[PDB]
Amino acid sequence: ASKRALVILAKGAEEMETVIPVDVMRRAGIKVTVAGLAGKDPVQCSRDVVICPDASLEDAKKEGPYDVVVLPGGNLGAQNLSESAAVKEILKEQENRKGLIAAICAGPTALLAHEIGFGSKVTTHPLAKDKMMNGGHYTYSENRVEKDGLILTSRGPGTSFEFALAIVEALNGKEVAAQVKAPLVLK
């Protein structure tokens, strides 16, 4: 029974923070759905890479629930996630069922917007710290990956492998994470 991941892809998402987790999760045998916030049309990422989603978010939701919901960063992508009523519903449902939520870079600021996981330790990109910490609803961490129970956060493009492997470990265990890691030629 393969674990399942929903990756929510919005215009302006950081394409490295999208593709690295998708690829690494698929290497781990996770069934990943790349869901387009705006529909099933191609998505123009922050550095103009264009990714064609597997499904619209609307359709992907109907196939839930998922073992993890993943929010990439990119400031504009995160803002689009933060403004979305559909994302709010998905995240609240995931929180209510005690499912993992993973967000990287500016992505965690969508948790703030949707009032998810208050009281957790979190990290973000350094430049997103002040936005995330508005109101003091979370406790800030400088760890490259932070995990406080079912809220898993990370910092930037250069922490994306660590973030992805932390998701793999949480879903499929340490041994699978180590097996997936070795062929990547990480330092």
**What's CA 11's distance to the chain center, in Å?**
15
Task: Give Cβ neighbours of residue 20 (< 8 Å, ≥ 6 apart).
Answer: 157, 160, 161, 163, 164
20 interacts with, out of Zn ion, a second copy, none, CB within 5 to 8 A per kind: a second copy
CA distance 52 to 173: 30
> Is there binding between residue 19 and a second copy (CB under 8 A)?
yes
Sign of CA dihedral 25, 78, 160, 168: negative
Which neighbouring-strand residues pair with 122? 140
- Tell me which of 45, 52, 105, 114 is the catalytic residue: 105
Is 45 one of the annotated active-site residues of the chain? no
Residues 104-133 that bind a second copy (CB under 8 A): 125-127
Q: Which of 65, 149, 158, 173 contacts a second copy by CB under 8 A? A: 158
Amino acid at 133: M
Is 52 one of the annotated active-site residues of the chain? no
Residues that bind a second copy (CB under 8 A): 14-16, 19-20, 22-23, 26-27, 34, 42, 46-52, 125-127, 144, 155-159, 161, 183-187
| Residues acting as catalytic residues | 105, 125
